[PDB]
Short mmCIF file of C-alpha atoms and ligand atoms in Angstrom, two decimals:
data_model
loop_
_atom_site.label_atom_id
_atom_site.label_comp_id
_atom_site.label_asym_id
_atom_site.label_seq_id
_atom_site.Cartn_x
_atom_site.Cartn_y
_atom_site.Cartn_z
CA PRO A 2 52.05 77.41 63.01
CA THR A 3 50.92 74.43 60.92
CA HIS A 4 54.11 72.36 60.75
CA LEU A 5 57.08 71.68 63.15
CA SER A 6 59.83 74.22 62.17
CA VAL A 7 63.17 72.77 61.25
CA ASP A 8 64.66 75.59 63.39
CA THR A 9 62.91 74.36 66.55
CA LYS A 10 65.20 72.98 69.20
CA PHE A 11 65.72 69.17 69.84
CA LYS A 12 66.85 68.12 73.38
CA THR A 13 69.77 65.73 72.74
CA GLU A 14 70.09 64.42 76.37
CA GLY A 15 68.42 61.09 75.65
CA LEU A 16 70.78 60.67 72.69
CA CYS A 17 74.23 61.07 74.49
CA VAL A 18 74.61 57.40 75.48
CA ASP A 19 74.44 56.02 72.00
CA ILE A 20 76.02 59.35 70.73
CA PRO A 21 78.61 60.65 73.25
CA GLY A 22 79.65 64.32 72.74
CA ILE A 23 76.35 65.28 71.12
CA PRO A 24 75.86 69.09 71.17
CA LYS A 25 73.34 70.36 73.75
CA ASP A 26 72.20 72.99 71.24
CA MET A 27 70.51 71.22 68.37
CA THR A 28 67.73 71.95 65.90
CA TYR A 29 65.61 69.72 63.67
CA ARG A 30 67.57 71.10 60.69
CA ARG A 31 70.98 70.15 62.15
CA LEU A 32 69.63 66.75 63.36
CA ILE A 33 68.12 65.71 59.98
CA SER A 34 71.40 66.85 58.30
CA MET A 35 73.41 64.68 60.82
CA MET A 36 71.17 61.75 60.11
CA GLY A 37 72.31 61.71 56.47
CA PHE A 38 69.42 63.59 54.90
CA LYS A 39 69.82 66.59 52.62
CA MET A 40 66.62 68.69 52.65
CA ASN A 41 68.06 70.96 49.83
CA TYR A 42 65.45 73.81 50.68
CA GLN A 43 62.36 72.17 49.40
CA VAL A 44 58.86 73.76 49.12
CA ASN A 45 57.21 70.47 47.97
CA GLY A 46 54.98 69.46 50.92
CA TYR A 47 57.75 67.92 53.01
CA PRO A 48 58.96 70.67 55.46
CA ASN A 49 60.21 68.35 58.18
CA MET A 50 60.74 64.61 58.74
CA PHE A 51 59.64 65.31 62.35
CA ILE A 52 56.13 66.43 63.24
CA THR A 53 54.18 68.35 65.98
CA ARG A 54 52.15 66.56 68.68
CA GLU A 55 48.93 68.00 66.99
CA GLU A 56 49.93 66.58 63.60
CA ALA A 57 50.78 63.19 65.12
CA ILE A 58 47.27 63.07 66.77
CA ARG A 59 45.59 63.90 63.45
CA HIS A 60 47.53 61.00 61.84
CA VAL A 61 47.30 58.50 64.76
CA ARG A 62 46.22 55.60 62.37
CA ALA A 63 49.83 56.06 60.82
CA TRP A 64 51.66 55.41 64.14
CA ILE A 65 54.27 52.59 64.31
CA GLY A 66 56.42 52.52 67.38
CA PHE A 67 59.99 52.10 66.37
CA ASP A 68 63.12 51.24 68.50
CA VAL A 69 66.62 50.10 67.57
CA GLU A 70 68.83 48.28 70.00
CA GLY A 71 72.56 48.04 69.55
CA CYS A 72 72.65 44.20 69.68
CA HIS A 73 76.50 44.00 69.99
CA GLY A 74 77.29 51.23 64.93
CA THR A 75 78.12 49.99 61.34
CA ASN A 76 80.59 47.48 63.06
CA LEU A 77 77.76 45.81 65.17
CA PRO A 78 74.40 44.35 64.07
CA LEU A 79 71.23 46.35 64.93
CA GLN A 80 67.92 44.92 66.27
CA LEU A 81 64.99 46.81 64.72
CA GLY A 82 61.77 46.61 66.68
CA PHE A 83 58.32 47.72 65.51
CA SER A 84 55.07 48.05 67.39
CA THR A 85 53.65 45.48 65.00
CA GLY A 86 55.55 42.92 67.24
CA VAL A 87 58.33 42.39 64.58
CA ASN A 88 62.03 42.18 65.31
CA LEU A 89 64.62 42.34 62.44
CA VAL A 90 68.37 41.74 62.81
CA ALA A 91 70.44 43.92 60.40
CA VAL A 92 74.11 43.25 59.79
CA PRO A 93 76.52 45.65 57.98
CA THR A 94 78.67 43.02 56.13
CA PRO A 95 57.77 39.21 69.56
CA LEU A 96 58.70 37.83 66.18
CA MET A 97 62.55 37.42 66.31
CA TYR A 98 64.17 37.16 62.82
CA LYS A 99 67.94 36.22 62.38
CA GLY A 100 70.84 38.42 61.09
CA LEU A 101 70.48 39.61 57.51
CA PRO A 102 71.97 42.47 55.43
CA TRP A 103 70.24 45.91 54.98
CA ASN A 104 69.31 45.36 51.33
CA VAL A 105 67.10 42.39 52.29
CA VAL A 106 65.96 43.96 55.61
CA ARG A 107 64.64 47.12 53.90
CA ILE A 108 62.37 45.01 51.63
CA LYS A 109 60.78 43.30 54.73
CA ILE A 110 60.25 46.85 56.24
CA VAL A 111 58.31 48.05 53.15
CA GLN A 112 56.27 44.80 53.15
CA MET A 113 55.36 45.05 56.84
CA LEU A 114 54.58 48.78 56.77
CA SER A 115 52.58 48.52 53.53
CA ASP A 116 50.51 45.55 54.87
CA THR A 117 49.94 47.14 58.29
CA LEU A 118 49.07 50.57 56.93
CA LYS A 119 47.33 50.30 53.50
CA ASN A 120 43.81 50.21 54.93
CA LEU A 121 44.64 52.53 57.78
CA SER A 122 46.56 55.64 56.55
CA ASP A 123 48.24 57.58 53.69
CA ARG A 124 51.53 57.72 55.62
CA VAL A 125 53.76 56.22 58.43
CA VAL A 126 54.65 58.12 61.73
CA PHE A 127 57.66 56.44 63.32
CA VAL A 128 56.88 56.98 67.08
CA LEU A 129 60.28 57.02 68.82
CA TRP A 130 61.84 57.29 72.36
CA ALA A 131 65.06 58.35 70.70
CA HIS A 132 68.40 57.23 72.09
CA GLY A 133 70.48 57.42 68.97
CA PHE A 134 70.50 54.22 66.88
CA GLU A 135 67.02 54.60 65.51
CA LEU A 136 67.98 57.94 63.80
CA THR A 137 71.37 56.62 62.52
CA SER A 138 69.62 53.53 61.01
CA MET A 139 66.98 55.55 59.07
CA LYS A 140 69.43 56.31 56.17
CA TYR A 141 69.46 52.49 55.52
CA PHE A 142 65.81 52.08 54.76
CA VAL A 143 64.54 55.69 54.15
CA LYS A 144 64.71 57.98 51.15
CA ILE A 145 63.30 61.55 51.17
CA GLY A 146 62.38 64.08 48.46
CA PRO A 147 59.43 66.19 47.08
CA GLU A 148 55.91 64.90 47.76
CA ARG A 149 54.75 62.40 45.11
CA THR A 150 51.78 60.33 43.84
CA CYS A 151 51.68 56.48 43.34
CA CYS A 152 52.87 55.18 39.89
CA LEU A 153 49.79 52.98 39.78
CA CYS A 154 47.21 55.41 41.40
CA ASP A 155 46.50 58.91 42.80
CA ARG A 156 47.24 58.20 46.50
CA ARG A 157 50.36 59.91 47.85
CA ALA A 158 53.70 57.93 47.58
CA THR A 159 54.85 56.06 50.69
CA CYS A 160 57.56 53.66 49.21
CA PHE A 161 60.22 53.86 46.50
CA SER A 162 62.00 51.19 44.32
CA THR A 163 65.68 51.41 43.41
CA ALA A 164 65.18 48.64 40.78
CA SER A 165 62.42 50.34 38.82
CA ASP A 166 63.08 54.06 39.76
CA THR A 167 59.34 54.38 40.58
CA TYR A 168 57.18 55.38 43.57
CA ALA A 169 54.07 53.75 45.12
CA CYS A 170 51.47 54.11 47.83
CA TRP A 171 50.91 51.39 50.54
CA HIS A 172 48.74 49.35 48.16
CA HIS A 173 50.97 49.09 45.10
CA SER A 174 54.42 48.64 46.76
CA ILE A 175 55.08 44.97 46.10
CA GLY A 176 58.82 44.61 45.57
CA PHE A 177 59.61 48.13 46.78
CA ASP A 178 62.72 48.63 48.98
CA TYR A 179 62.75 52.11 50.40
CA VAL A 180 60.38 53.97 52.88
CA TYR A 181 59.72 57.22 51.11
CA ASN A 182 59.04 60.46 52.92
CA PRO A 183 58.12 59.01 56.31
CA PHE A 184 57.22 60.99 59.40
CA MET A 185 58.39 60.73 62.95
CA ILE A 186 57.88 62.04 66.43
CA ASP A 187 60.24 61.71 69.50
CA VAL A 188 58.19 61.13 72.69
CA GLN A 189 61.31 62.10 74.71
CA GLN A 190 60.80 65.66 73.46
CA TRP A 191 57.67 65.97 75.55
CA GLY A 192 59.36 66.47 78.95
CA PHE A 193 59.54 63.06 80.63
CA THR A 194 61.45 62.41 83.80
CA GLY A 195 63.07 58.98 83.72
CA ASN A 196 63.19 56.17 81.19
CA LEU A 197 60.63 54.50 78.88
CA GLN A 198 59.69 51.61 81.17
CA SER A 199 59.26 53.71 84.28
CA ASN A 200 56.89 56.16 82.46
CA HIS A 201 55.04 53.47 80.58
CA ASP A 202 54.43 51.21 83.62
CA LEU A 203 52.71 54.19 85.45
CA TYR A 204 49.67 53.70 83.07
CA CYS A 205 49.86 50.21 81.60
CA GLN A 206 50.23 46.63 83.04
CA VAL A 207 49.48 44.82 79.65
CA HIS A 208 52.93 45.46 77.93
CA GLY A 209 55.93 43.91 79.58
CA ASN A 210 59.59 44.49 78.87
CA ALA A 211 61.13 41.24 77.44
CA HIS A 212 64.14 43.56 76.64
CA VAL A 213 63.68 43.07 72.86
CA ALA A 214 63.42 46.16 70.59
CA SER A 215 59.72 45.39 69.61
CA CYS A 216 58.79 45.53 73.36
CA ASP A 217 60.14 49.10 73.59
CA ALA A 218 58.41 50.05 70.30
CA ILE A 219 55.08 48.80 71.75
CA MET A 220 55.66 50.61 75.19
CA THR A 221 56.60 53.84 73.26
CA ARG A 222 53.51 53.93 70.99
CA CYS A 223 51.37 52.88 74.07
CA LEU A 224 52.80 55.86 76.10
CA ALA A 225 52.22 58.16 73.11
CA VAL A 226 48.53 57.00 72.89
CA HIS A 227 48.08 57.47 76.74
CA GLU A 228 49.47 61.07 76.53
CA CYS A 229 47.35 62.07 73.47
CA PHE A 230 44.13 60.05 73.92
CA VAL A 231 43.86 58.86 77.56
CA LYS A 232 44.96 61.91 79.59
CA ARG A 233 44.34 64.43 76.90
CA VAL A 234 41.01 64.27 75.01
CA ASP A 235 40.31 66.24 71.82
CA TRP A 236 36.88 65.27 70.37
CA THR A 237 36.99 68.14 67.77
CA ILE A 238 39.59 66.35 65.64
CA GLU A 239 37.78 64.67 62.68
CA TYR A 240 39.27 61.65 60.92
CA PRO A 241 38.90 60.49 57.30
CA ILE A 242 36.44 57.70 56.30
CA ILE A 243 38.44 54.55 55.62
CA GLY A 244 35.83 51.80 56.03
CA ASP A 245 32.28 51.02 57.13
CA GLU A 246 32.00 53.99 59.48
CA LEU A 247 28.73 55.29 58.03
CA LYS A 248 26.97 51.88 57.83
CA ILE A 249 28.28 51.01 61.41
CA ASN A 250 26.98 54.35 62.81
CA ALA A 251 23.69 54.02 60.94
CA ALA A 252 23.22 50.44 62.22
CA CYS A 253 23.95 51.56 65.74
CA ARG A 254 21.08 54.14 65.61
CA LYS A 255 18.69 51.37 64.13
CA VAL A 256 19.70 48.78 66.80
CA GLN A 257 19.27 51.23 69.68
CA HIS A 258 15.80 52.40 68.46
CA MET A 259 14.70 48.75 68.13
CA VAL A 260 16.13 47.32 71.40
CA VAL A 261 14.94 50.29 73.45
CA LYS A 262 11.41 50.42 71.81
CA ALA A 263 10.91 46.67 72.40
CA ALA A 264 12.00 46.81 75.99
CA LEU A 265 9.46 49.55 76.70
CA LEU A 266 6.64 47.50 75.09
CA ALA A 267 7.60 44.19 76.79
CA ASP A 268 7.98 45.53 80.26
CA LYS A 269 6.21 48.94 80.19
CA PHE A 270 8.78 50.67 82.54
CA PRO A 271 7.32 54.01 83.64
CA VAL A 272 10.79 55.74 83.74
CA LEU A 273 13.97 55.44 81.66
CA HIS A 274 17.28 56.66 83.04
CA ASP A 275 19.41 57.54 80.08
CA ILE A 276 23.04 57.63 81.27
CA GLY A 277 25.65 58.77 78.80
CA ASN A 278 26.28 61.31 76.05
CA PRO A 279 25.39 64.84 77.18
CA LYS A 280 24.49 65.58 73.54
CA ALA A 281 21.89 62.69 73.31
CA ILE A 282 18.20 62.63 72.14
CA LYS A 283 15.29 60.13 72.98
CA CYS A 284 16.04 57.16 70.68
CA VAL A 285 12.26 56.11 70.85
CA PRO A 286 10.60 59.65 70.65
CA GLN A 287 7.05 58.23 70.56
CA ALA A 288 7.50 56.06 73.74
CA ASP A 289 5.13 56.44 76.71
CA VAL A 290 7.98 56.32 79.36
CA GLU A 291 9.40 59.25 81.39
CA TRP A 292 12.76 60.06 79.74
CA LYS A 293 15.39 61.42 82.25
CA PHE A 294 18.85 62.25 80.90
CA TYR A 295 22.19 62.19 82.80
CA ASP A 296 25.37 63.66 81.23
CA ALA A 297 28.53 61.47 81.22
CA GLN A 298 31.33 61.90 78.69
CA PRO A 299 33.03 58.78 77.21
CA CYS A 300 35.57 57.49 79.73
CA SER A 301 38.97 57.12 78.12
CA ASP A 302 41.01 56.09 81.18
CA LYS A 303 39.15 53.50 83.39
CA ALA A 304 35.51 52.53 83.24
CA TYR A 305 33.14 54.61 85.51
CA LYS A 306 32.37 53.37 88.98
CA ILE A 307 28.54 52.83 89.26
CA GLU A 308 28.81 54.04 92.85
CA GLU A 309 30.20 57.40 91.76
CA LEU A 310 27.71 57.74 88.79
CA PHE A 311 24.58 57.16 90.83
CA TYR A 312 25.18 57.70 94.56
CA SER A 313 26.30 60.74 96.78
CA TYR A 314 22.68 62.28 96.48
CA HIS A 315 18.02 63.28 89.21
CA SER A 316 15.34 60.68 89.83
CA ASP A 317 17.75 59.41 92.66
CA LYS A 318 15.87 56.04 92.32
CA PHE A 319 17.74 54.45 89.41
CA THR A 320 16.15 51.13 90.52
CA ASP A 321 12.79 52.58 89.25
CA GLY A 322 12.25 51.50 85.63
CA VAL A 323 15.15 50.84 83.31
CA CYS A 324 18.68 52.29 82.81
CA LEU A 325 20.06 52.79 79.24
CA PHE A 326 23.90 52.68 79.12
CA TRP A 327 24.40 53.27 75.35
CA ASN A 328 28.24 53.27 75.20
CA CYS A 329 28.62 54.58 78.70
CA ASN A 330 31.26 52.06 80.05
CA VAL A 331 30.81 51.27 83.73
CA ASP A 332 32.44 48.74 86.11
CA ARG A 333 29.24 46.83 87.00
CA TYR A 334 25.89 47.52 85.45
CA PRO A 335 22.72 47.43 87.55
CA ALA A 336 20.32 44.51 86.94
CA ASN A 337 17.66 46.84 85.38
CA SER A 338 19.88 47.90 82.43
CA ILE A 339 19.90 47.90 78.62
CA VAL A 340 23.62 48.12 77.63
CA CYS A 341 25.78 48.55 74.46
CA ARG A 342 29.45 48.00 75.33
CA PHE A 343 32.23 48.11 72.75
CA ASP A 344 34.54 45.09 72.86
CA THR A 345 38.09 46.45 72.70
CA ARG A 346 39.44 43.08 71.62
CA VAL A 347 37.69 43.23 68.15
CA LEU A 348 40.10 43.14 65.29
CA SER A 349 39.43 45.89 62.71
CA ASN A 350 40.64 48.90 60.62
CA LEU A 351 38.72 51.20 63.04
CA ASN A 352 40.28 49.67 66.18
CA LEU A 353 43.91 50.42 67.07
CA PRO A 354 45.79 48.89 70.06
CA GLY A 355 45.42 51.00 73.15
CA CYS A 356 46.79 51.63 76.67
CA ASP A 357 46.25 49.21 79.65
CA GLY A 358 44.23 46.70 77.60
CA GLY A 359 41.93 49.35 76.27
CA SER A 360 41.75 50.34 72.54
CA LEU A 361 41.68 53.46 70.42
CA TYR A 362 38.42 53.32 68.41
CA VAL A 363 38.60 55.76 65.53
CA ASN A 364 35.30 56.44 63.82
CA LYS A 365 35.03 60.10 62.75
CA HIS A 366 36.62 60.76 66.21
CA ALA A 367 39.29 59.10 68.32
CA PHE A 368 37.86 57.45 71.45
CA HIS A 369 40.27 55.60 73.76
CA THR A 370 38.02 52.86 75.29
CA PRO A 371 38.76 51.03 78.61
CA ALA A 372 39.46 47.29 78.46
CA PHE A 373 36.44 45.14 77.89
CA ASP A 374 35.78 43.19 81.10
CA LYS A 375 33.15 40.37 81.04
CA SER A 376 32.44 40.78 84.77
CA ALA A 377 30.81 44.21 84.12
CA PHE A 378 27.71 42.26 82.91
CA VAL A 379 27.07 39.80 85.85
CA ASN A 380 23.53 41.10 86.58
CA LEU A 381 22.59 41.08 82.85
CA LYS A 382 22.28 38.50 80.05
CA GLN A 383 23.28 38.80 76.34
CA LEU A 384 20.49 40.39 74.34
CA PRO A 385 19.49 38.00 71.51
CA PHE A 386 18.73 38.92 68.00
CA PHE A 387 15.14 39.97 67.25
CA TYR A 388 13.35 42.27 64.76
CA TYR A 389 10.16 43.89 65.97
CA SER A 390 7.63 45.84 63.85
CA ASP A 391 4.17 47.28 64.40
CA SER A 392 4.08 49.03 60.99
CA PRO A 393 1.36 47.96 58.56
CA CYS A 394 2.13 45.14 56.10
CA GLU A 395 2.37 47.25 52.91
CA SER A 396 5.10 46.56 50.18
CA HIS A 397 5.14 50.03 48.50
CA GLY A 398 7.50 50.42 45.46
CA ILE A 399 14.84 43.99 44.75
CA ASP A 400 13.41 40.37 44.55
CA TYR A 401 11.67 38.04 46.99
CA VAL A 402 12.31 34.45 48.56
CA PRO A 403 9.76 33.65 51.34
CA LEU A 404 11.09 34.58 54.80
CA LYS A 405 10.74 32.07 57.62
CA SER A 406 11.98 33.19 61.01
CA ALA A 407 11.06 32.84 64.67
CA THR A 408 12.82 36.20 65.44
CA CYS A 409 10.61 38.26 63.09
CA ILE A 410 8.17 39.76 65.65
CA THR A 411 5.37 41.09 63.23
CA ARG A 412 1.62 40.74 62.79
CA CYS A 413 2.11 38.89 59.55
CA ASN A 414 4.36 36.33 61.29
CA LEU A 415 1.79 36.06 64.05
CA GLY A 416 -0.91 35.35 61.37
CA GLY A 417 1.29 32.62 59.90
CA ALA A 418 3.10 34.24 56.92
CA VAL A 419 5.62 37.14 56.70
CA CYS A 420 4.71 39.80 54.07
CA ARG A 421 7.23 41.14 51.48
CA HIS A 422 7.64 44.55 53.28
CA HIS A 423 8.47 43.09 56.68
CA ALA A 424 10.76 40.47 55.01
CA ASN A 425 12.80 43.27 53.33
CA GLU A 426 12.81 45.16 56.66
CA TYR A 427 13.87 42.09 58.62
CA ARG A 428 16.78 41.31 56.29
CA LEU A 429 17.89 44.92 56.11
CA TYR A 430 17.79 45.09 59.97
CA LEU A 431 19.66 41.73 60.34
CA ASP A 432 22.43 43.24 58.14
CA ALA A 433 22.67 46.39 60.14
CA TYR A 434 22.69 44.25 63.28
CA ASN A 435 25.47 41.90 61.91
CA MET A 436 27.44 45.03 60.81
CA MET A 437 27.30 46.64 64.23
CA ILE A 438 28.06 43.35 66.08
CA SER A 439 31.06 42.57 63.81
CA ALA A 440 32.23 46.29 64.32
CA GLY A 441 32.85 45.16 67.99
CA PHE A 442 29.64 46.31 69.83
CA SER A 443 27.98 43.98 72.33
CA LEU A 444 24.39 44.17 73.53
CA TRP A 445 23.26 43.20 77.04
CA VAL A 446 19.83 43.31 78.69
CA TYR A 447 18.12 42.63 82.10
CA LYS A 448 17.53 38.90 82.79
CA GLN A 449 13.66 39.21 82.60
CA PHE A 450 13.74 40.48 78.96
CA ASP A 451 11.56 38.02 76.90
CA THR A 452 10.64 38.68 73.25
CA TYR A 453 7.51 36.49 73.79
CA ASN A 454 6.00 39.53 75.49
CA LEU A 455 6.02 41.46 72.14
CA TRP A 456 3.53 39.22 70.37
CA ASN A 457 0.70 40.55 72.61
CA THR A 458 1.45 44.18 71.48
CA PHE A 459 -0.85 43.56 68.36
CA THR A 460 -4.40 42.67 69.62
O1 LQP B 19 75.09 59.81 59.86
C1 LQP B 19 75.09 59.16 60.96
C2 LQP B 19 75.96 57.99 61.03
O2 LQP B 19 77.34 58.20 60.81
C3 LQP B 19 77.80 58.29 59.42
F1 LQP B 19 79.09 58.36 59.30
F2 LQP B 19 77.44 57.21 58.71
N1 LQP B 19 74.37 59.49 62.03
C4 LQP B 19 72.92 59.59 62.03
C5 LQP B 19 72.69 60.83 62.98
C6 LQP B 19 71.86 60.49 64.24
C7 LQP B 19 72.35 61.60 65.17
C8 LQP B 19 73.86 61.51 65.03
C9 LQP B 19 74.07 61.19 63.56
C10 LQP B 19 74.94 59.92 63.28
ZN1 ZN B 20 48.91 53.30 44.51
ZN1 ZN B 21 51.24 49.74 77.48
ZN1 ZN B 22 3.97 42.46 57.52
#
């Protein structure tokens, strides 16, 4: 049981309005055949156009919600809608494009999918809420066959060109006209009572139905993400490295050590309440403080209520000392906190649009994150950049341009001149910091946090 068998049944009920008289008994094998695709018994890595829910989750980065609306059936024009917000009108002679033939529409489809997916995935997964027209229209922009490699590289083939008779991946597909060997999943096959809007609206207020095909494409992919990442959570599924994942994670660990170490020196809190990851370790192992840990998994639905995390009877006194919420998303942070909160609005290859304003952050693992809300941080202030060091000024072992900064909290800068070692360390840390900030993480601290209190820690 690795792939979805072509002899598995397909419920055709949601298909009988666009396709009246459709057989109740239907398989993937009969469906694909009906759609105009000859599989020809092929053992070349393409067993089925349709995929399992587990395979769809593994290839979430590849998801594109797709919906076709019968605008007026080879006699009438079709409105193609994609979760990218695009709307194409195809004729058989929220970006709403006018009526054009299939030969020109298919070119735009390859451009759009290639530009959206090149940095994200090795494939496309057409996420559907199948009513009939989306499956009839696939023969006009899709070609299938044995699994292939790009004509210009070693990545797997995702497009095809009828002009040059060649294949290409998402990167080298300029001028290509066919979507080669795509994947798809029908969300209606998962046992839903009622239509798309009714089921989507149960979990999301952010996507509205303007009645265009792209709105349904967005609601479909949203509902698919809710089902697989919000209500169901699988943190065992690993995901490929497609960006700055290792530098972002390394930066995160450096920023946390720094920020937490400095707060303990500036305000000498006797106790630290570490609320978050049940698999966490002391980020400042040599600190004087009393480290008390409290397990809390990453919330994927709605941000935790601070009342339910702390109260109902542990130190019990969370007001004693400082609270460290490192990626533990709560509705309103106490005033004595140090917080790292991922901003779901950040635009990146790691961040995918989520459910109810939240986002799917995929970095080694998929984490659906609740919508960033600026009000969560009313009793806190933004933590400013600073680099603190108590290490000796010793170069050991790159070139040098004198460093001048007010945010380099070191003994050398106290003395009047920053040494080469602390200048390399400051610049390296500022890069890790800028990396982590740009990757969408925001840092917040208690209002009394003053870096002026760190200069006295060398006496
Ligand atoms: O092949 C077609 C369109 O008709 C043909 F004559 F062009 N289709 C695609 C399949 C979708 C399920 C029912 C099938 C109808
Ligand atoms: Zn290529
Ligand atoms: Zn939604
Ligand atoms: Zn120094």
